[PDB]
Amino acid sequence: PPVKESSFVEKMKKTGRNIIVFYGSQTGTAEEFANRLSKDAHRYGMRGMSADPEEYDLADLSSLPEIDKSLVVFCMATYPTDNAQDFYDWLQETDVDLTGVKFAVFGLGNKTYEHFNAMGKYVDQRLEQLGAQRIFELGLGDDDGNLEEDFITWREQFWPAVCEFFGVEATEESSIRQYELVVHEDMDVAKVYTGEMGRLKSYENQKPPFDAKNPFLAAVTANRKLNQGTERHLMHLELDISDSKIRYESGDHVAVYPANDSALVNQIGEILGADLDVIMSLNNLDEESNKKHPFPCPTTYRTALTYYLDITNPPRTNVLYELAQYASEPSEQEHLHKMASSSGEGKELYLSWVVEARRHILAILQDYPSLRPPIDHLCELLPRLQARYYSIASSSKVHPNSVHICAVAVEYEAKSGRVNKGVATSWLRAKEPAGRALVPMFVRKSQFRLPFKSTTPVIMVGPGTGIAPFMGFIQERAWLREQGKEVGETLLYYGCRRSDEDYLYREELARFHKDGALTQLNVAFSREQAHKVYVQHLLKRDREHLWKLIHEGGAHIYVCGDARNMAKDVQNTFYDIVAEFGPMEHTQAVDYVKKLMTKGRYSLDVWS
Numbered sequence: 001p002p003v004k005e006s007s008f009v010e011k012m013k014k015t016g017r018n019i020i021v022f023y024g025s026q027t028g029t030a031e032e033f034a035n036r037l038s039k040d041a042h043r044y045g046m047r048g049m050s051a052d053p054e055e056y057d058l059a060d061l062s063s064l065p066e067i068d069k070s071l072v073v074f075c076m077a078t079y080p081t082d083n084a085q086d087f088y089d090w091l092q093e094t095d096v097d098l099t100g101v102k103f104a105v106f107g108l109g110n111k112t113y114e115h116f117n118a119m120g121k122y123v124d125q126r127l128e129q130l131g132a133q134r135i136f137e138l139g140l141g142d143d144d145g146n147l148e149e150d151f152i153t154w155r156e157q158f159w160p161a162v163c164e165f166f167g168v169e170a171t172e173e174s175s176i177r178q179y180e181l182v183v184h185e186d187m188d189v190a191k192v193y194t195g196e197m198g199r200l201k202s203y204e205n206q207k208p209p210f211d212a213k214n215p216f217l218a219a220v221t222a223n224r225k226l227n228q229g230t231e232r233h234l235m236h237l238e239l240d241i242s243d244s245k246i247r248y249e250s251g252d253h254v255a256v257y258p259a260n261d262s263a264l265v266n267q268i269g270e271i272l273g274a275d276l277d278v279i280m281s282l283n284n285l286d287e288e289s290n291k292k293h294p295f296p297c298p299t300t301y302r303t304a305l306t307y308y309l310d311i312t313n314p315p316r317t318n319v320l321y322e323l324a325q326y327a328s329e330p331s332e333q334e335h336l337h338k339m340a341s342s343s344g345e346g347k348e349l350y351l352s353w354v355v356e357a358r359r360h361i362l363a364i365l366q367d368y369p370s371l372r373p374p375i376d377h378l379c380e381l382l383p384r385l386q387a388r389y390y391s392i393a394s395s396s397k398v399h400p401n402s403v404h405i406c407a408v409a410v411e412y413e414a415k416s417g418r419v420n421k422g423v424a425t426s427w428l429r430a431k432e433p434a435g436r437a438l439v440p441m442f443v444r445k446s447q448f449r450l451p452f453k454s455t456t457p458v459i460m461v462g463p464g465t466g467i468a469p470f471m472g473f474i475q476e477r478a479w480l481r482e483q484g485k486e487v488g489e490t491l492l493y494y495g496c497r498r499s500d501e502d503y504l505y506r507e508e509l510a511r512f513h514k515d516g517a518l519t520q521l522n523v524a525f526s527r528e529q530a531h532k533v534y535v536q537h538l539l540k541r542d543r544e545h546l547w548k549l550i551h552e553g554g555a556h557i558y559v560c561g562d563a564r565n566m567a568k569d570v571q572n573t574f575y576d577i578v579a580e581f582g583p584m585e586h587t588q589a590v591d592y593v594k595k596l597m598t599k600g601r602y603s604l605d606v607w608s
């Protein structure tokens with residue numbers, strides 16, 4: 001387990017802080033919201049700190065009242081995030097009295113998902129049960145609409161509520177730097193970071209175990225085009241994890257740390273008139289903080305912009321707010337300044353011109369030519385470049401030393417006028433098997449798993465790239481049959497546009513079906529006729545048999561792919577099947593299916 005830092009309350013006392021903001025975050029959204037709230041404190045005569053609850057023992061919350069006008073805020077996203085597990089387990093377990101504790105929670109969720117803001121709601125509810133007093137209403141941010149805006153709305157009401165309760169004054173301050181720039185003219189190249197994530201030279205000198213902090217650089221042994229046509233580009237990659245000691249199972253995910261497009265990095269440097277090869281460090285102006293830098297330093301701006309910073313997603317409102325000061329044309333400074341509005345034209349412009357048009361930082365620098373911020377401050381403002389997850393497309397029973405990836409390359413026309421390229425997929429696509437192509441990765445254990453007993457029936461639904469984990473599932477069920485095991489029915493419900501356009505793993509699937517590994521290979525070709533044909537239309541077609549498998553055969557259902565519409569439509573079709581054959585009313589059919597998920601017989605691996 002992690003070695004906990006010493007009491008966060010004592011740390012707050014020693015540094016004159018009265019507010020602490022904890023972040024439950026997986027892809028850094030809640031973390032950035034916490035950082036923003038922590039920084040806001042200064043604007044109201046207070047002082048805060050942002051913190052990862054995993055590095056602390058939240059039992060010390062009971063000591064928080066020892067600090068006058070103290071308050072704790074929780075920015076929690078749902079998936080309970082890995083870093084919030086300890087805190088979560090603690091909440092359920094303790095009977096500690098948090099009398100005198102003042103709190104507020106802001107949840108990050110997405111309605112297209114089952115348990116919307118479950119974590120956020122739990123924390124807010126539990127702290128009250130334990131005796132603490134809510135200082136502001138629970139926030140319910142929905143990433144399906146616009147999370148940034150929900151945060152803005154909440155934040156705007158939160159602070160005045162806080163000032164009113166503690167009797168503090170709102171004042172309105174000038175720009176404040178979190179880090180100071182230190183340029184290094186003399187530096188042993190052996191101490192300059194070049195893209196590694198953890199220890200310096202950890203990419204060059206690999207040492208297990210390998211994880212998110214110390215990714216394993218896996219060699220790309222294969223990278224082939226899966227689709228037959230040219231409308232899009234879908235690919236299959238095989239990463240060699242030999243000698244990595246990494247363990248995995250069909251259903252797990254593989255994460256990769258990509259590199260941004262070099263041309264995009266070069267242009268940002270060029271438009272800002274900056275020398276990207278300058279070696280430097282951004283050092284926290286708060287020498288007490290454990291966050292010494294915003295990213296591994298010392299390093300060059302080029303390396304930072306390539307491996308450490310997100311330069312492709314639309315900049316958040318606070319970033320544009322802080323950049324406004326560097327736009328010399330009044331109208332541009334005004335537009336940038338107003339992006340953080342909670343209503344009106346400023347808000348509408350942010351939603352349409354930045355978010356909807358998908359303008360990345362370079363696009364904004366190009367379209368607002370008066371905006372010329374210094375490179376070091378920009379690097380301090382940009383979010384960190386995140387790893388991308390993929391559903392491992394292979395079975396470890398068959399490929400113990402290789403992790404396969406099935407992915408669609410992202411490349412689309414943005415309303416901003418440019419063609420936007422997906423970071424990880426463009427980078428993966430360019431990896432050519434060999435001075436060999438290496439991909440920094442690690443595996444994340446999931447709960448998406450084949451049944452324990454070989455005899456249990458399996459129903460897999462995964463159109464498009466949703467086929468990914470099922471290639472592994474099928475490889476494994478085929479292996480079991482080869483091993484003399486008794487394997488129940490294995491049905492695949494797959495979907496693509498046309499058999500001659502993007503039928504992924506066409507030959508492999510035909511083989512598994514021929515050999516009996518697949519009991520049924522049901523494929524919906526959505527564009528081979530005037531009307532759409534989807535996997536759920538095939539599920540409805542086979543309702544009688546599927547009900548038999550589910551109700552009498554104890555079958556396990558698996559859905560993978562599009563979380564936005566496909567997953568929901570498929571779930572609805574299952575409701576209808578249950579409703580008809582139970583038989584039972586729709587409401588009871590829903591409870592039936594929801595119960596299957598709790599009992600591990602209806603699993604999901606969907607993304608958007």
Ligand SMILES: Cc1cc2nc3c(=O)[nH]c(=O)nc-3n(C[C@H](O)[C@H](O)[C@H](O)COP(=O)(O)OP(=O)(O)OC[C@H]3O[C@@H](n4cnc5c(N)ncnc54)[C@H](O)[C@@H]3O)c2cc1C
Nearest residue numbers: 388389390391406407408410412422423424425465468607
């Ligand atoms: C658990 C999990 C499993 C996953 N499994 C797989 C998998 O097995 N195979 C796979 O291909 N992907 C999978 N993904 C998705 C994957 O992690 C990446 O999100 C995806 O590959 C795109 O990454 P990228 O870096 O190439 O694109 P990025 O640079 O990250 O850009 C992605 C963003 O581009 C924007 N965008 C995409 N198209 C448009 C458009 N047409 N118009 C406007 N905006 C658009 C959206 O905001 C999208 O979020 C999975 C994701 C999760 C979370």
Ligand SMILES: Cc1cc2nc3c(=O)[nH]c(=O)nc-3n(C[C@H](O)[C@H](O)[C@H](O)COP(=O)(O)O)c2cc1C
Nearest residue numbers: 025026027028029030077078109110113115116117
């Ligand atoms: C695999 C996956 C599963 C998710 N499951 C849920 C969920 O059950 N409930 C919910 O409200 N949001 C869910 N979300 C949405 C996130 O909670 C939302 O995007 C949040 O903003 C992410 O914050 P982070 O970057 O700080 O982790 C999911 C997102 C992904 C990618």
